[PDB]
Amino acid sequence: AHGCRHVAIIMDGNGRWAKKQGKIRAFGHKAGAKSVRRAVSFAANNGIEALTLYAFSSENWNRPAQEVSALMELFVWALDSEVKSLHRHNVRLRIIGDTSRFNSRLQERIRKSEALTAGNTGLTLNIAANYGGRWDIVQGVRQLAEKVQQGNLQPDQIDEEMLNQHVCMHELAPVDLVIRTGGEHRISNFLLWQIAYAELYFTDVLWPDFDEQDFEGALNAFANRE
Amino acid sequence: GCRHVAIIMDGNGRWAKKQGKIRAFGHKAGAKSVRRAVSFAANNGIEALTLYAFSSSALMELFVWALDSEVKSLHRHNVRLRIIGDTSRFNSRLQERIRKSEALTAGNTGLTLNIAANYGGRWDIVQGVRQLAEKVQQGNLQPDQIDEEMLNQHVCMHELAPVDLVIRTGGEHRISNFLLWQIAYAELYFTDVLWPDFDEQDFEGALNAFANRERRF
Ligand SMILES: O=P(O)(O)C(O)(Cc1cccc(-c2cccc3c2oc2ccccc23)c1)P(=O)(O)O
Ligand SMILES: O=P(O)(O)C(O)(Cc1cccc(-c2cccc3c2oc2ccccc23)c1)P(=O)(O)O
Ligand SMILES: O=P(O)(O)C(O)(Cc1cccc(-c2cccc3c2oc2ccccc23)c1)P(=O)(O)O
Ligand SMILES: O=P(O)(O)C(O)(Cc1cccc(-c2cccc3c2oc2ccccc23)c1)P(=O)(O)O
Ligand SMILES: O=P(O)(O)C(O)(Cc1cccc(-c2cccc3c2oc2ccccc23)c1)P(=O)(O)O
Ligand SMILES: O=P(O)(O)C(O)(Cc1cccc(-c2cccc3c2oc2ccccc23)c1)P(=O)(O)O
Structure with a gap:
């Protein structure tokens, strides 16, 4: 009934969320991962065809460029255990972003993950990694x-x-709705070409607290902005 | 400090309907609102203002008339005028008035006013x-x-300050294939106010919000 085929989310607010709890950033990353699982689950169960996710980093400016790089590696590394779970849930995984400079082992892991899940008929999950619109x-x-x-x-x-x-994503339904959590009202060089006609929905909710009811709220806002 | 503001103007028709008036009446109040926005921006030190008339020969002639009757005043007011968009197919007379209008103001150093005509990002x-x-x-x-x-x-506009703030009036929350490449890092500000009603207080609200967000983010 929402009529939304492809949702893109700029996730933000994990560090601020932890900070408010008196916890270090790492605890925020933990709670944010749980929120990602929960949004993917919601999307799959709500007939959304594609969900595209972009992790906006508020701390990256304070991180040396060489740490960032290594951060991209841990991401792919973690993405070897998570794919097993995505595959069990019939999720088709795609990585979008400039992965041409990653080492061969990573590039192999990525392609193998997309090949393994390419035939799944559930939600198509696009994860941005080193992406810029x-x-x-x-x-x-x-x-x-x-x-x-x-x-x-x-x-x-x-x-x-x-x-x-x-x-990127030209072969999928066009992006109908972009959600950005965490309070900032910018696209921050996420998708540009692809959002020419999409509805833009901004919420102050920090990523760890963004749950099914917040996602339904955005979808209903979309349905109504028709 | 906001240097370049882009505005998606929308709502003249809905506005006229609520007043029980015809589309032409909404256009008239709309032109007045463009005039006030341009003055406001120039008076508050904004370096560039980019306007996109969102719509869901008569016009072409009015465009000629508009240029002929207002360019001397824009030049006087130190405004640099540019039309952005695919004008390649407008009639030659209009294409020449546009070119001459931009040439006459090319040297001005006050507000650069960019008007979208058949433009798409x-x-x-x-x-x-x-x-x-x-x-x-x-x-x-x-x-x-x-x-x-x-x-x-x-x-388009690579010679100017980067777009810092995009305002869309009329209530829709979409870019509608206005600027895309250019708004990669811009603050986006949506207001339900209909274009004819968009005034100095509404424009100030968007500017203050930009400045506060610059402080916070
Ligand atoms: O955990 P911290 O943020 O404290 C830090 O160790 C960097 C870091 C180490 C290990 C994991 C992560 C991490 C975990 C989940 C998601 C993301 C992480 O880092 C980024 C950067 C950009 C986007 C997402 C994530 C970050 P730091 O050098 O910034 O102190
Ligand atoms: O946890 P479930 O397998 O139930 C599900 O949420 C999918 C999912 C679960 C767990 C993690 C992720 C996910 C997906 C891709 C990458 C990463 C994920 O979680 C993390 C944490 C840290 C780094 C990368 C990822 C997705 P589902 O929609 O298939 O039920
Ligand atoms: O939200 P912040 O900008 O504060 C930050 O947590 C970066 C971040 C933004 C959005 C999401 C995540 C994040 C955290 C854990 C797991 C995953 C995250 O994003 C994805 C994408 C795909 C799979 C798993 C995760 C991290 P940070 O490291 O810059 O403090
Ligand atoms: O500057 P950009 O915003 O283009 C980007 O490079 C920022 C980035 C750098 C390094 C890592 C990540 C990232 C993104 C999603 C999930 C995770 C990331 O890093 C880690 C480490 C450990 C677990 C998950 C993630 C993001 P992007 O990969 O989010 O496009
Ligand atoms: O077709 P008509 O000549 O009847 C009329 O619609 C002409 C008209 C007057 C004023 C503005 C517009 C108009 C309509 C759609 C888009 C744009 C209009 O004016 C501009 C200027 C710059 C860019 C786009 C538009 C049309 P009207 O207002 O005199 O009834
Ligand atoms: O706001 P609506 O989408 O209802 C519509 O008025 C189109 C329109 C949108 C925004 C501005 C204008 C308009 C009207 C009069 C004068 C000028 C307008 O736009 C510009 C740009 C530059 C100079 C003058 C005008 C018209 P419409 O013709 O499609 O009903």
Whole structure:
């Protein structure tokens, strides 16, 4: 009844949530993981076809660039145990983002995870990893530029419909709703091309507290903004 | 400090209906609201204001009339005018009035006023992409040297301050294929106020909210 086929969520607020409890950041990450499981569960049980998730990091600015990098590795590493669970729940997993510089072992783990679940018929879960909406448009542009160089494409032949076929998730239903938790009212270079016509829904709720009733609220807001 | 504000103007028609009036009446109050927003922005030190008339030859002629009767005043008021969007198919007379209007004000140093006409964010990115494909075809550019900075140099308004705040009136919470590339880091502010009613107090509310959020985030 919500009529929403594909929801994207900019998750934020985990560190502030922990801070308020008098707990260190790591406890926030723990509670945030639980909230991710819960939103994925809700989406699957509510007939949403695709759910795309972006972890917005409020602390990354204070982290040296080389820690960030290693942080991307732990993510893929953790993503080897979690896939087993996603697969048991009939979830099809896709990673979107610039994974070309990750080491071969990671790239292999990622492809194997997407291959394992590619045939599942449940929710399609897209996880952003090293993703940027401008980078997304740029990688599509590069693919087209390569065709132009080969001599198979004239610059005047490039139109929206063609660039669209080369940005992330072009093969899935278009994003109908973007939710951003944590209070900030910005897209922060998450999807740009893909959100041209999506409903944007912002809530002050911190990610760890964002639960099924908050997700239903966004979906009903969407249904009503029709 | 907000340097560039973009506004998705919407609600003139709904506004006229609530008054029991026709669409033309909503357009008239709408023009007055554009005038007040432009003055407000110029008076409060905003460097660029970008306006997008959201709609769900008569016009083309009015566009000519509008340019002919207001450009001298915008020039006088030190406003730099730019039209962003695909005007490639407007009639030549109008295309020439646009070009001349931008040329006459190209040197002004006050508010840059960007008016969208047949503009779309995807189209904007696509025109930038065509320009880069031309250099690849010419042989002056390798596909793998194309990066964000380079495409950024080929989308509308790259010569101005980055868009800091996007305001959409009328109650919808969508970008509707207005700016996309350009709003990657902008504060987004939605208000149910209908365009004709959008006034200095409403505009101040969006500006104060931007400044406070800049402080908090
Ligand atoms: O746990 P802390 O945030 O205290 C820190 O160890 C960095 C870190 C270590 C181990 C795991 C994580 C972590 C865990 C879950 C999600 C994410 C984490 O780090 C990021 C960054 C960006 C997005 C998501 C997550 C972060 P720090 O160097 O910032 O103190
Ligand atoms: O816990 P369930 O298997 O019941 C389910 O929530 C799916 C799910 C469970 C647990 C974790 C995740 C998930 C998915 C991808 C990556 C990561 C997940 O949780 C973490 C924690 C830390 C790092 C990465 C991930 C998803 P479901 O919708 O399939 O029932
Ligand atoms: O919310 P904050 O910006 O405070 C921060 O927790 C980063 C963060 C944002 C959003 C989600 C998560 C997070 C935490 C644990 C598990 C997972 C998170 O995001 C995903 C995506 C996919 C699978 C698992 C998780 C972390 P931080 O490390 O910058 O303090
Ligand atoms: O600057 P960006 O916002 O583009 C990004 O690189 C930030 C980022 C850097 C490093 C790790 C993560 C990240 C994202 C989701 C889940 C987890 C991340 O890091 C960890 C560590 C341990 C468990 C989960 C996650 C995010 P992104 O991967 O969220 O696109
Ligand atoms: O078709 P008509 O000539 O009857 C009329 O709609 C013309 C009209 C007057 C004023 C504004 C508009 C109008 C309508 C849709 C979009 C835009 C309009 O004006 C601008 C300016 C710049 C960008 C978009 C629009 C139309 P009207 O208000 O004089 O009845
Ligand atoms: O607000 P609505 O979407 O109801 C509609 O008035 C279209 C419209 C939206 C926003 C502004 C305008 C409009 C009206 C009069 C003058 C000008 C308008 O937009 C601009 C931009 C620049 C200069 C003058 C005007 C028209 P409509 O013609 O589709 O009913």
